[PDB]
Write an enzyme that holds these catalytic residues in place. Structure first.
Site, PDB file in Angstrom:
ATOM      1  N   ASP A  95     -32.647  38.484 -13.296  1.00  0.00           N
ATOM      2  CA  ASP A  95     -32.710  37.083 -12.891  1.00  0.00           C
ATOM      3  C   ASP A  95     -31.451  36.493 -13.494  1.00  0.00           C
ATOM      4  O   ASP A  95     -30.930  37.035 -14.467  1.00  0.00           O
ATOM      5  CB  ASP A  95     -33.959  36.452 -13.524  1.00  0.00           C
ATOM      6  CG  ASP A  95     -34.346  35.142 -12.908  1.00  0.00           C
ATOM      7  OD1 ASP A  95     -33.531  34.229 -12.800  1.00  0.00           O
ATOM      8  OD2 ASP A  95     -35.518  34.998 -12.570  1.00  0.00           O
ATOM      9  N   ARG A  97     -31.334  33.526 -14.768  1.00  0.00           N
ATOM     10  CA  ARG A  97     -31.821  32.664 -15.841  1.00  0.00           C
ATOM     11  C   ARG A  97     -32.237  33.533 -17.036  1.00  0.00           C
ATOM     12  O   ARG A  97     -32.437  34.746 -16.907  1.00  0.00           O
ATOM     13  CB  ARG A  97     -33.024  31.852 -15.363  1.00  0.00           C
ATOM     14  CG  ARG A  97     -32.728  30.660 -14.464  1.00  0.00           C
ATOM     15  CD  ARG A  97     -34.046  30.131 -13.812  1.00  0.00           C
ATOM     16  NE  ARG A  97     -34.933  29.441 -14.756  1.00  0.00           N
ATOM     17  CZ  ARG A  97     -36.270  29.400 -14.702  1.00  0.00           C
ATOM     18  NH1 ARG A  97     -36.950  30.010 -13.738  1.00  0.00           N
ATOM     19  NH2 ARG A  97     -36.935  28.727 -15.629  1.00  0.00           N
ATOM     20  N   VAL A 116     -29.271  38.824  -7.849  1.00  0.00           N
ATOM     21  CA  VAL A 116     -29.064  39.960  -6.961  1.00  0.00           C
ATOM     22  C   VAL A 116     -28.621  39.590  -5.542  1.00  0.00           C
ATOM     23  O   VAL A 116     -29.045  38.577  -4.973  1.00  0.00           O
ATOM     24  CB  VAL A 116     -30.346  40.830  -6.819  1.00  0.00           C
ATOM     25  CG1 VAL A 116     -30.961  41.128  -8.180  1.00  0.00           C
ATOM     26  CG2 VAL A 116     -31.340  40.156  -5.881  1.00  0.00           C
ATOM     27  N   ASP A 138     -40.243  37.666  -7.068  1.00  0.00           N
ATOM     28  CA  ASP A 138     -40.739  36.310  -7.213  1.00  0.00           C
ATOM     29  C   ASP A 138     -39.553  35.366  -7.152  1.00  0.00           C
ATOM     30  O   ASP A 138     -39.557  34.326  -7.784  1.00  0.00           O
ATOM     31  CB  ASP A 138     -41.525  36.159  -8.528  1.00  0.00           C
ATOM     32  CG  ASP A 138     -42.316  34.859  -8.596  1.00  0.00           C
ATOM     33  OD1 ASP A 138     -42.875  34.387  -7.576  1.00  0.00           O
ATOM     34  OD2 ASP A 138     -42.354  34.282  -9.689  1.00  0.00           O
ATOM     35  N   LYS A 169     -43.495  37.658  -2.937  1.00  0.00           N
ATOM     36  CA  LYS A 169     -43.890  36.264  -2.895  1.00  0.00           C
ATOM     37  C   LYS A 169     -43.971  35.923  -1.390  1.00  0.00           C
ATOM     38  O   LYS A 169     -43.028  36.198  -0.655  1.00  0.00           O
ATOM     39  CB  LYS A 169     -42.768  35.476  -3.558  1.00  0.00           C
ATOM     40  CG  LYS A 169     -43.022  34.034  -3.775  1.00  0.00           C
ATOM     41  CD  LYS A 169     -41.761  33.404  -4.216  1.00  0.00           C
ATOM     42  CE  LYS A 169     -41.980  32.004  -4.727  1.00  0.00           C
ATOM     43  NZ  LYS A 169     -42.655  32.062  -6.053  1.00  0.00           N
ATOM     44  N   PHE A 174     -44.060  25.676   6.890  1.00  0.00           N
ATOM     45  CA  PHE A 174     -45.016  24.762   7.503  1.00  0.00           C
ATOM     46  C   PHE A 174     -44.665  24.546   8.971  1.00  0.00           C
ATOM     47  O   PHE A 174     -43.498  24.365   9.307  1.00  0.00           O
ATOM     48  CB  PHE A 174     -45.056  23.460   6.713  1.00  0.00           C
ATOM     49  CG  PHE A 174     -45.368  23.673   5.265  1.00  0.00           C
ATOM     50  CD1 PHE A 174     -46.434  24.504   4.897  1.00  0.00           C
ATOM     51  CD2 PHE A 174     -44.568  23.120   4.272  1.00  0.00           C
ATOM     52  CE1 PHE A 174     -46.706  24.781   3.576  1.00  0.00           C
ATOM     53  CE2 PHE A 174     -44.826  23.388   2.930  1.00  0.00           C
ATOM     54  CZ  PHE A 174     -45.901  24.226   2.583  1.00  0.00           C
ATOM     55  N   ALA A 200     -50.132  27.161  -0.556  1.00  0.00           N
ATOM     56  CA  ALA A 200     -50.386  28.078   0.563  1.00  0.00           C
ATOM     57  C   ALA A 200     -49.748  29.436   0.293  1.00  0.00           C
ATOM     58  O   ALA A 200     -49.698  30.296   1.171  1.00  0.00           O
ATOM     59  CB  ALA A 200     -49.837  27.489   1.840  1.00  0.00           C
TER      60      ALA A 200
HETATM   61  N1  LIG Z   1     -31.022  36.516  -5.998  1.00  0.00           N
HETATM   62  C1  LIG Z   1     -31.800  36.351  -7.077  1.00  0.00           C
HETATM   63  N2  LIG Z   1     -31.844  37.333  -7.978  1.00  0.00           N
HETATM   64  C2  LIG Z   1     -32.561  37.217  -9.069  1.00  0.00           C
HETATM   65  N3  LIG Z   1     -33.285  36.199  -9.409  1.00  0.00           N
HETATM   66  C3  LIG Z   1     -33.244  35.194  -8.500  1.00  0.00           C
HETATM   67  C4  LIG Z   1     -32.545  35.184  -7.341  1.00  0.00           C
HETATM   68  N4  LIG Z   1     -32.724  33.966  -6.652  1.00  0.00           N
HETATM   69  C5  LIG Z   1     -33.525  33.282  -7.402  1.00  0.00           C
HETATM   70  N5  LIG Z   1     -33.898  33.970  -8.552  1.00  0.00           N
HETATM   71  C6  LIG Z   1     -34.836  33.537  -9.625  1.00  0.00           C
HETATM   72  O1  LIG Z   1     -36.102  33.315  -9.001  1.00  0.00           O
HETATM   73  C7  LIG Z   1     -36.826  32.696 -10.111  1.00  0.00           C
HETATM   74  C8  LIG Z   1     -38.018  31.869  -9.540  1.00  0.00           C
HETATM   75  S1  LIG Z   1     -39.259  31.420 -10.776  1.00  0.00           S
HETATM   76  C9  LIG Z   1     -39.718  33.077 -11.298  1.00  0.00           C
HETATM   77  C10 LIG Z   1     -40.752  33.086 -12.423  1.00  0.00           C
HETATM   78  C11 LIG Z   1     -41.009  34.460 -13.050  1.00  0.00           C
HETATM   79  N6  LIG Z   1     -41.432  35.414 -12.019  1.00  0.00           N
HETATM   80  C12 LIG Z   1     -42.060  34.318 -14.169  1.00  0.00           C
HETATM   81  O2  LIG Z   1     -42.859  35.260 -14.339  1.00  0.00           O
HETATM   82  O3  LIG Z   1     -41.922  33.380 -14.993  1.00  0.00           O
HETATM   83  C13 LIG Z   1     -35.825  31.808 -10.977  1.00  0.00           C
HETATM   84  O4  LIG Z   1     -35.804  32.240 -12.373  1.00  0.00           O
HETATM   85  C14 LIG Z   1     -34.536  32.178 -10.247  1.00  0.00           C
HETATM   86  O5  LIG Z   1     -33.368  32.237 -11.119  1.00  0.00           O
HETATM   87  C1  LIG Z   2     -49.439  22.738   1.456  1.00  0.00           C
HETATM   88  N1  LIG Z   2     -48.817  22.106   2.619  1.00  0.00           N
HETATM   89  C2  LIG Z   2     -47.831  21.233   2.318  1.00  0.00           C
HETATM   90  N2  LIG Z   2     -47.504  20.986   1.055  1.00  0.00           N
HETATM   91  C3  LIG Z   2     -47.211  20.613   3.417  1.00  0.00           C
HETATM   92  C4  LIG Z   2     -47.693  20.963   4.722  1.00  0.00           C
HETATM   93  N3  LIG Z   2     -48.680  21.820   5.022  1.00  0.00           N
HETATM   94  C5  LIG Z   2     -49.180  22.339   3.889  1.00  0.00           C
HETATM   95  O1  LIG Z   2     -50.219  23.242   4.072  1.00  0.00           O
END
Ligand SMILES: Nc1ncnc2c1ncn2[C@@H]1O[C@H](CSCC[C@H](N)C(=O)O)[C@@H](O)[C@H]1O
Ligand SMILES: C[n+]1c(N)cc[nH]c1=O
Ligand SMILES: Nc1ncnc2c1ncn2[C@@H]1O[C@H](CSCC[C@H](N)C(=O)O)[C@@H](O)[C@H]1O
Ligand SMILES: C[n+]1c(N)cc[nH]c1=O
Lengths: 291, 291
Positions: A95, A97, A116, A138, A169, A174, A200
């Site tokens: 990541d 971060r 990545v 994620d 993930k 929507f 959702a």
């Molecule tokens: N291309 C990429 N490669 C690696 N990390 C990425 C990315 N695009 C976004 N991210 C990362 O996606 C994350 C979303 S939040 C992830 C939370 C983590 N899974 C937990 O267990 O706490 C952020 O930290 C962000 O920097």
């Molecule tokens: C969760 N949700 C939103 N936040 C916006 C639209 N439709 C929906 O299911």
């Protein structure tokens, strides 16, 4: 009080048997009730997924490549759990971060500070070779444009990394914000207890047999369906008190959590599933500092 | 003479039961023996594919989108064949080059002068809607780089067009010119009689059920296998005289052609399959001006 009797919770998307017109007002409602609820949501899902792979004998000896892992506090619990069970696993957390410092100093876990891209995926694949790879994604950029782009990156993770299994993930754009149909890997749409109140989002779990890769198209009509099914789950179901659930907490999410935790393996032997689950839950909440 | 007895010809790639180390010297050998052999090669394969769709009841009422159709002389025969059988089909032929003028003036066939790109595919899909689409692709840029790019375009044709079936040009990059693994749609690898002497090209035939899309990875080891299996087919098999093949021409390619033609439907009733095939072959060769 909102009481009800349930046999089992909705484990996967397909199981949701009803739907409700989405009320945009719900977006203004309290999204979270527990501290570090997001870490709990992820920990339960990833424990569920990984225990399955163990059950299928494909976890031991693998390298789990977790992209979008930071901060990753809950990942330390996951690691300890399988490490204490005797399962040999290498973790590679990537990541841009920074990760929770509790993840440092472990020979079995490598922390990488890199966002990545396809090119990077190729280099890690060459470097991980010949190890079997389990992918957990994620990543988060949002707009439907951001989503599609994230989903396109996730498919490229699988094609390049060629993992034996993956957890991705998955939240459908929507309907009123539809752009174009797209494909996502075929897998089980695992439902997530402790997800935000009106979320959702689910996790796509896949196991790769042979050298094939099955995808599935997602259309606006599918997006309409996701919205109504998930809205019915969030507004009605998750607000239920399962009164025939003999457990310290009878709310739907604990009933749902119970079913996930009952699949988890332990060293300690228990006289009942209820005993194992209470132990796992106690252990998880204490680790996460959730009262 | 090179004589042999055969039950049936190799219809698909998987059937080839032997392999031979590729001899680069073979590239200097006579590639073609018949005039307009390329039109014949395509006509047989496309007649085979389309007759299958008819057999499965998915041809009638479809729009065949043929990309990389020019000149397309043989396409006029295909069109007449199904048109005379009573099958209702619209043809949409797209290529940046000019088509054989024998294709003009037919209300059921639209000629488009355009090199397709993803953006264009989207507009034709919106315009063809709500018709069911059968895709035939014969696009050609070559280098492995050109190939991969052609194959990537072909996968995008299927994702955007969402056809009920497809026939795609398929020739694996040569091992010594490998670049990277890639995916191609899952389908039957149809073998082609009258392909150039040492050609490793085949046609990928797919029928799309449900809303899924299965792909398959292709690796250098697969590329090594394609080369040896196809070399054995070209050097040994196709050079055989099937002496237990009672037919005016006993060469392998006519034996192979026979099996494809026997699947084709006709208005005229024949007392034997041999009678139908001789008729279809006679008809095809006369149309193409092949002695
Ligand atoms: N291309 C990429 N490669 C690696 N990390 C990425 C990315 N695009 C976004 N991210 C990362 O996606 C994350 C979303 S939040 C992830 C939370 C983590 N899974 C937990 O267990 O706490 C952020 O930290 C962000 O920097
Ligand atoms: C969760 N949700 C939103 N936040 C916006 C639209 N439709 C929906 O299911
Ligand atoms: N993006 C693209 N869109 C349409 N046609 C393309 C293309 N890229 C290449 N082509 C066409 O691919 C063709 C390869 S030869 C095709 C022969 C034709 N199928 C026949 O029956 O005679 C060339 O005519 C070339 O112009
Ligand atoms: C047909 N062929 C070539 N023309 C070059 C390499 N390998 C091969 O099978």
């Amino acid at each position: 009080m909102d009481v009800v009797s349930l046999d089992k919770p909705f484990m996967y998307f397909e199981e949701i048997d009803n739907e409700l017109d989405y009320e945009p007002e719900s977006a203004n409602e309290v999204a979270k009730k527990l501290p570090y609820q997001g870490q709990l949501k992820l920990l339960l899902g990833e424990l569920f997924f990984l225990s399955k792979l163990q059950r299928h004998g494909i976890l031991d000896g693998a390298t789990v490549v977790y992209i979008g892992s930071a901060p990753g506090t809950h990942i330390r619990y996951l690691r300890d759990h399988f490490y204490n069970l005797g399962v040999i696993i290498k973790w590679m957390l990537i990541d841009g971060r920074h990760h929770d410092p509790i993840l440092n100093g472990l020979r079995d876990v490598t922390l990488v500070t890199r966002f990545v891209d396809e090119e990077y995926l190729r280099s890690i694949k060459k470097q991980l070779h010949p190890s079997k790879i389990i992918l957990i994604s994620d990543v988060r950029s949002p707009s439907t444009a951001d989503l599609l782009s994230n989903y396109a990156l996730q498919n490229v993770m699988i094609s390049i990394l060629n993992p034996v299994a993956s957890s991705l993930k998955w939240r459908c754009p929507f309907p009123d914000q539809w752009i174009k149909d797209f494909y996502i890997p075929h897998g089980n749409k695992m439902l997530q207890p402790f997800a935000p109140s009106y979320s959702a989002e689910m996790r796509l779990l896949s196991i790769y047999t042979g050298e094939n890769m099955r995808l599935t198209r997602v259309t606006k009509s599918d997006a309409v369906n996701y919205e109504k099914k998930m809205y019915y789950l969030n507004k009605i179901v998750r607000n239920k008190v399962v009164v025939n659930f003999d457990y310290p907490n009878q709310e739907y999410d604990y009933f749902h959590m119970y079913f996930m935790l009952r699949t988890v393996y332990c060293n300690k032997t228990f006289p009942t599933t209820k005993a194992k689950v209470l132990f796992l839950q106690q252990s998880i909440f204490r680790f996460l500092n959730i009262p």
